[PDB]
Design a protein around this ligand. Structure first.
Ligand SMILES: [Cl-]
Lengths: 83, 83
């Protein structure tokens, strides 16, 4: 099973090194984690909290922040950005 | 965020009490639990394994079995049966 990111999440994925149109969900998480890392969107002191409120990811996901421990919310926010 | 099961997952969900045409991921997972557990698709001896080769569920997931601890696979198999 491969998934097809909608266009804006595609651009987001490519900006940290993804190359195709379709990905396993594992590839999508990998690039999501790279993106949050390289952009430093996490709290320094509570590293599992992501502030994405000023960022394209907050727009795509629909939320101004979340924690990486909210797996179900993260999967749901991803679904919205899949064709 | 409301998801909308395609017709087969809907059938599965209805058969274990769901009424709506739309659900939270929270609910979708609950009913699915209900489904597996009320038909005893899981192995008695190693209970994290669900065997669905002889069941409606194997047809919608596309696997002969899966393990409840494989969350990424579960969400992925679920997205293909959603809008
Ligand atoms: Cl909750």
């Amino acid at each position: 099973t491969l998934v097809r990111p909608k266009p804006l999440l595609l651009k987001l994925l490519k900006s940290v090194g993804a190359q195709k149109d379709t990905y396993t969900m594992k590839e999508v998480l990998f690039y999501l984690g790279q993106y949050i890392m390289t952009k430093r969107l996490y709290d320094e002191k509570q590293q599992h909290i992501v502030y994405c409120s000023n960022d394209l990811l907050g727009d795509l996901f629909g939320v101004p922040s979340f924690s990486v421990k909210e797996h179900r919310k993260i999967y749901t926010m991803i679904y919205r950005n899949l064709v």
